[PDB]
Design a protein around this ligand. Sequence first.
Ligand SMILES: Cc1cc2c(cc1F)OC[C@@H](NS(=O)(=O)c1cc(C(=O)N3CC(C)(C#N)C3)c(C)[nH]1)C2
Ligand SMILES: [Ca+2]
Length: 129
Amino acid sequence: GDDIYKAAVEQLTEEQKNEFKAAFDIFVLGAEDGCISTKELGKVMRMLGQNPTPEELQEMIDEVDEDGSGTVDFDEFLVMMVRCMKDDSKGAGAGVRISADAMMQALLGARAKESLDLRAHLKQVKKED
Ligand SMILES: Cc1cc2c(cc1F)OC[C@@H](NS(=O)(=O)c1cc(C(=O)N3CC(C)(C#N)C3)c(C)[nH]1)C2
Ligand SMILES: [Ca+2]
């Protein structure tokens, strides 16, 4: 069940979508539909500093895929990206776990700081002390 996560993307801020967007550019490198599949994911995952398997890879894509087409778009990446950094995507299953912050370091790099969570800065018509 993904009701809270799927909604998380909505809570995100304009800066968030962009911060993560730049990552998809590299994450979907070569992809025909700019989506992340077993091929693309396998490339990045390996570059992150690990050595996953082709069978497990597909499990991740579908594990995050909302429709289950076989790949992940820019939106399907945010839904998981939220829980990825929160480390609450699985809870307590297996040691296997991808780092959201560490991932960006591969795609874009160190171009993701507090600014990423601009949502906290100010995205409404109000102010407090
Ligand atoms: C398309 C997409 C999906 C996911 C991505 C990043 C993406 F690009 O990252 C998070 C992933 N969910 S997960 O539960 O962390 C997770 C990690 C793994 C895995 O194969 N391994 C971790 C490993 C490298 C080790 N040790 C082996 C599995 C099976 N689930 C789902
Ligand atoms: Ca899909």
